[PDB]
């Protein structure tokens, strides 16, 4: 039983920008989701060894999680808000792929995804 290396949070050869929207994605969007009662399963990479989900990384090949997202934001990893929104989308999609409608974890993800969409419906203007 082996977890893979977690996604990178720094990369010196990737272009980065400090954007008004990206600051909002950390200050408001991430930080708010993080405090939700259903946030905890998503706050770190899936440890398939601890959770005894040995088939997880047999199935999920582009893992993502809010802890990785938060580190990427704090580390100025992204060029634009769409890159970071894509990571959120990968996180939710992975959960929907591995699990089935009605599972507790899927109900948690559905609730978080709706809050996430509410929060990104309106982003600060790329002044
Ligand atoms: C979001 C990533 N991710 C999955 O795809 C997934 C599948 C089955 C269980 C779990 C757990 S758990 O065991 O702590 N759990 C919390 C609620 C249900 C059970 C935490 C995080 C998980 C899973």
Swiss-Prot record:
There is a cross-link at residue 58 (Glycyl lysine isopeptide (Lys-Gly) (interchain with G-Cter in SUMO2)). It is found in: Nucleus; Chromosome. It comes from the Eukaryota. The record marks 99 as: Acetylated histone binding. Residues 17-123 form the Bromo domain. Coiled coil: none annotated. Ubiquitously expressed. Phosphorylation by CK2 disrupt the intramolecular binding between the bromo domain 2 and the NPS region and promotes binding between the NPS and the BID regions, leading to activate the protein and promote binding to acetylated histones. In absence of phosphorylation, BRD4 does not localize to p53/TP53 target gene promoters, phosphorylation promoting recruitment to p53/TP53 target promoters. The NET domain mediates interaction with a number of chromatin proteins involved in transcription regulation (NSD3, JMJD6, CHD4, GLTSCR1 and ATAD5). Belongs to the BET family. Interacts with p53/TP53; the interaction is direct. Interacts (via CTD region) with CDK9 and CCNT1, acting as an associated component of P-TEFb complex. Interacts with RELA (when acetylated at 'Lys-310'). Interacts (via NET domain) with NSD3, CHD4, BICRA and ATAD5. The interaction with BICRA bridges BRD4 to the GBAF complex. Interacts (via NET domain) with JMJD6 (via JmjC and N-terminal domains); the interaction is stronger in presence of ssRNA and recruits JMJD6 on distal enhancers. Interacts with NSD3. Interacts with NIPBL. It is linked to Cornelia de Lange syndrome 6: A form of Cornelia de Lange syndrome, a clinically heterogeneous developmental disorder associated with malformations affecting multiple systems. It is characterized by facial dysmorphisms, abnormal hands and feet, growth delay, cognitive retardation, hirsutism, gastroesophageal dysfunction and cardiac, ophthalmologic and genitourinary anomalies. CDLS6 inheritance is autosomal dominant. A chromosomal aberration involving BRD4 is found in a rare, aggressive, and lethal carcinoma arising in midline organs of young people. Translocation t(15;19)(q14;p13) with NUTM1 which produces a BRD4-NUTM1 fusion protein. JQ1, a thieno-triazolo-1,4-diazepine derivative, and I-BET, a benzodiazepine derivative, have been tested on tumors with success. Treatment with GSK1210151A (I-BET151, a I-BET derivative) has strong effets on mixed lineage leukemia and promotes myeloid differentiation and leukemia stem-cell depletion. Chromatin reader protein that recognizes and binds acetylated histones and plays a key role in transmission of epigenetic memory across cell divisions and transcription regulation. Remains associated with acetylated chromatin throughout the entire cell cycle and provides epigenetic memory for postmitotic G1 gene transcription by preserving acetylated chromatin status and maintaining high-order chromatin structure. During interphase, plays a key role in regulating the transcription of signal-inducible genes by associating with the P-TEFb complex and recruiting it to promoters. This is Bromodomain-containing protein 4. It comes from Homo sapiens (Human).
């Amino acid at each position: 039983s082996m977890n893979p290396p977690p996604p990178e949070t720094s990369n010196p050869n990737k272009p980065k920008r400090q954007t008004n929207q990206l600051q909002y994605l950390l200050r408001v969007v991430l930080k708010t989701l993080w405090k939700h009662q259903f946030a905890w399963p998503f706050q770190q990479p899936v440890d398939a060894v601890k959770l005894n989900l040995p088939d997880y990384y047999k199935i999920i090949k582009t893992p993502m999680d809010m802890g990785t997202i938060k580190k990427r934001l704090e580390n100025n990893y992204y060029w634009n808000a769409q890159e970071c929104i894509q990571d959120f989308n990968t996180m939710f999609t992975n959960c929907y792929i591995y699990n089935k409608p009605g599972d507790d974890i899927v109900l948690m993800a559905e609730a978080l995804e709706k809050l996430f969409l509410q929060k990104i419906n309106e982003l600060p203007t790329e002044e």
